């Protein structure tokens, strides 16, 4: 049969997993998932003190191609929070697998053409996670402080993906000095609460 034949690679193509069982080794995850191929993996704990693999389920992994990045998230299941793998079957059973990706493209959170990024006009933004998205950070700064030109995350260069802080591009109004004057507020949004930090960019 047949339905498509399309290819996507603008996605990050290390995944995070945590729903490995409680005895694994590369070559068993290397056979819970598919199309991903030959693969490179690294453990949260490997040192000659216990194991080569770790006590848990938490793995960090990517592998050589990026076409598969959408073709293996495509045969399983998604949430605009997390996605999920059906790959209950060895020694764990009826729990899918915690799984995320990242949006190597999607980490510029453009949102008007007047100002590009410039050093007069960025500012810095502090506090966010990696695992999440600019999706935080320019909502926050849209809901009370709008006028916002560009938006984004601090990234690697190494594979695009997040490093720590985030950042901003915009100077079009008092909107921009209350934001870069309010360098601590209050969200209540996900993990954090308060004390995110707004500066000018150096």
């Known amino acids: 049969s047949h339905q498509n034949g399309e290819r996507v690679e603008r996605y990050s193509r290390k995944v995070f997993v945590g729903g490995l069982p409680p005895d694994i080794d590369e070559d068993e995850i290397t056979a819970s998932f598919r199309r991903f191929g030959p693969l490179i993996v690294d453990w949260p704990h490997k040192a000659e003190s216990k194991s080569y693999f770790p ?3 938490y793995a960090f992994l990517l592998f050589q191609d990026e076409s598969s990045v959408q073709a293996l998230i495509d045969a399983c299941i998604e949430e605009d929070g997390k996605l999920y793998l059906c790959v209950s ?6 729990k899918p697998v915690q799984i995320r990706p990242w949006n190597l493209s999607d980490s510029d959170f453009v949102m008007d053409g007047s100002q590009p990024l410039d050093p007069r006009k960025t500012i810095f933004v502090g506090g ?3 695992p999440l998205r600019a999706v935080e950070l320019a909502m926050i700064m849209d809901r009370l402080y709008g006028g916002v030109c560009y938006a984004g ?3 690697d260069p190494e594979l695009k993906y997040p490093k720590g802080a985030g950042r901003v591009a915009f100077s079009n109004q008092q909107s921009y000095i ?3 004057s309010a360098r601590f507020v209050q969200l209540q949004h996900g993990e954090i609460d308060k004390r995110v930090e707004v500066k000018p960019y150096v």
Do not use: E, L, N
């Open 55 to 57: 006590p848990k389920g």
């Open 153 to 155: 995350i601090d990234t």
């Open 89 to 94: 079957s060895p020694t764990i059973k009826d």
């Open 128 to 130: 966010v996670p990696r």
């Open 178 to 180: 209350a934001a870069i």
